[PDB]
Amino acid sequence: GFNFSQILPDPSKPSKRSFIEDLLFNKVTLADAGFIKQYGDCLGDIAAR
Amino acid sequence: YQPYRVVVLSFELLHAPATVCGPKKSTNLVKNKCVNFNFNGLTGTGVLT
Numbered sequence: 581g582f583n584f585s586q587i588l589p590d591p592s593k594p595s596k597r598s599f600i601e602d603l604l605f606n607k608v609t610l611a612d613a614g615f616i617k618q619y620g621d622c623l624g625d626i627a628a629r
Numbered sequence: 630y631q632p633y634r635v636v637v638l639s640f641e642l643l644h645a646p647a648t649v650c651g652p653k654k655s656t657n658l659v660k661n662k663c664v665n666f667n668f669n670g671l672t673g674t675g676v677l678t
């Protein structure tokens with residue numbers, strides 16, 4: 581009778597994240613990003629500020 | 630006590646567009662490759678766009 585559906589992963593996503601885990605991912609916003617392969621970027625563009 | 634003749638020069642440096650310049654011949658304008666440059670005494674190295 582216990583229902584662990586919201587904390588176990590679901591296969592429909594392309595990751596093994598559950599319903600609480602991607603709620604937790606979309607609340608930690610970043611003051612600066614990490615790596616988006618921004619090295620092709622920042623060269624020759626105008627949106628490099 | 631013999632008289633001396635004095636000239637005093639005075640100028641700003643790298644503030645605004647310039648009028649008095651130096652005896653140097655220009656070149657063309659190459660883009661999108663790492664070159665040195667010289668814009669009115671301002672040196673540097675990089676890529677123009």
Ligand SMILES: *[C@@H]1O[C@H](CO)[C@@H](O[C@@H]2O[C@H](CO)[C@@H](O)[C@H](O)[C@H]2NC(C)=O)[C@H](O)[C@H]1NC(C)=O
Nearest residue numbers: 581582583584585586587588590592598599600
């Ligand atoms: C465990 O809880 C979840 C969430 O309440 C249940 O998922 C729901 O299932 C019904 C099917 O009758 C759907 O209509 C709802 O849309 C589902 N909710 C969500 C948020 O997806 C799940 O059925 C429960 N497990 C059991 C065995 O009852």
